[PDB]
Design a protein around this ligand. Structure first.
Ligand SMILES: [Ca+2]
Ligand SMILES: [Ca+2]
Ligand SMILES: [Ca+2]
Ligand SMILES: [Ca+2]
Ligand SMILES: [Cl-]
Ligand SMILES: [Cl-]
Ligand SMILES: [Cl-]
Ligand code: NA
Ligand SMILES: [Zn+2]
Ligand SMILES: [Zn+2]
Length: 316
């Protein structure tokens, strides 16, 4: 909508304070004009029709507990935007500065968040399994990365392709978490999962077996549930990306870590230049090796670490 660009202040789902870009027209709306064609955050008001109402606040202060999920959906959509723009020169999810629309307070006790093809959607959680899902920057960026994947490789959401699709979202979710630089780790959804239980998460990239996910191709899940195990087999590729960055010795294979920024450069290039809708794990390894070759040279340490990390997780 039309109005003046303003800066409000509020508290997100975890109780931290942050500034947010708003637009003033009688009310202050969660409409950020500083990023592409805008970031817009809506109240679904516990209904399921979308997008709901552009979020309106009387005084540009967002400290009510009802406001927190909106503060975070809005602010982390901006962080994710800044990551892809500043780090990879990609303008919004479609590379053309598409508006990022998010709705919060979707449904009641809904234990999930998703990119729906047009917008982000956040449940509040039931307060036991989850608190409002926008509170997790890695969740926000994981879901927005599905949009990136859709506009690039178009990985099919089933079997190994689908597990690469999930891993790509976990990888870039994590890298946005590190980019934001507040409380980053290699776990997924730690900030919003199970508020009664400290130290857990939905999955771990550094040790997938901690939550029962495979960390080696010989352990891949071959059943039909979860679209052929897409949130399960992602552990194989997560662990490989973790090793490329941090290094380590995994099933007796030594990997020299090359750090997060080079992990990102390599996987982004693989995603945008080499993956196709039906890429499998072996083709991902080839894509990552070619990407590292493009960027660092075929005799580089970077290319050797990519090979080591894939060998370590049994993907030839
Ligand atoms: Ca207010
Ligand atoms: Ca974290
Ligand atoms: Ca995390
Ligand atoms: Ca927890
Ligand atoms: Cl917070
Ligand atoms: Cl998902
Ligand atoms: Cl190879
Ligand atoms: Na699990
Ligand atoms: Zn996902
Ligand atoms: Zn290990």
């Amino acid at each position: 909508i039309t109005g003046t660009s303003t800066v409000g202040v509020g508290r997100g789902v975890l109780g931290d304070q942050k500034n947010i870009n708003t637009t003033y027209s009688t009310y202050y709306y969660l409409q950020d004009n500083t990023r592409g064609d805008g970031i817009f955050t809506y109240d679904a008001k516990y209904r399921t029709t979308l997008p709901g109402s552009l979020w309106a606040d009387a005084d540009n202060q967002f400290f009510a507990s009802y406001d927190a999920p909106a503060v975070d959906a809005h602010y982390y959509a901006g962080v994710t935007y800044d990551y892809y723009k500043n780090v990879h020169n990609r303008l919004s999810y479609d590379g053309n500065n598409a508006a990022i629309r998010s709705s919060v307070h979707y449904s009641q006790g809904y234990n999930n968040a998703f990119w729906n093809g047009s917008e982000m959607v956040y449940g509040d959680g039931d307060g036991q399994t989850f608190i409002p899902l926008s509170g997790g920057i890695d969740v926000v960026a994981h879901e927005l990365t599905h949009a990136v994947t859709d506009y690039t490789a178009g990985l099919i959401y089933q079997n190994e392709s689908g597990a690469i699709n999930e891993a790509i979202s976990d990888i870039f979710g994590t890298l946005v978490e590190f980019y934001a630089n507040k409380n980053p780790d290699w776990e997924i959804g730690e900030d919003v999962y199970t508020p009664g239980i400290s130290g857990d998460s939905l999955r771990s990239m550094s040790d997938p077996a901690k939550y029962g996910d495979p960390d080696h191709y010989s352990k891949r899940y071959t059943g039909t549930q979860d679209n052929g195990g897409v949130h399960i087999n992602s552990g194989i590729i997560n662990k490989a990306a973790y090793l490329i960055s941090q290094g380590g010795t995994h099933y007796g294979v030594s990997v020299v870590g090359i750090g997060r920024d080079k992990l990102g450069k390599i996987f982004y290039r693989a995603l945008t230049q080499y993956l196709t809708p039906t890429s499998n794990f072996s083709q991902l390894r080839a894509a990552a090796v070619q990407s590292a070759t493009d960027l660092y040279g075929s005799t580089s340490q970077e290319v050797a670490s990519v090979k080591q990390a894939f060998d370590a997780v049994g993907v030839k």
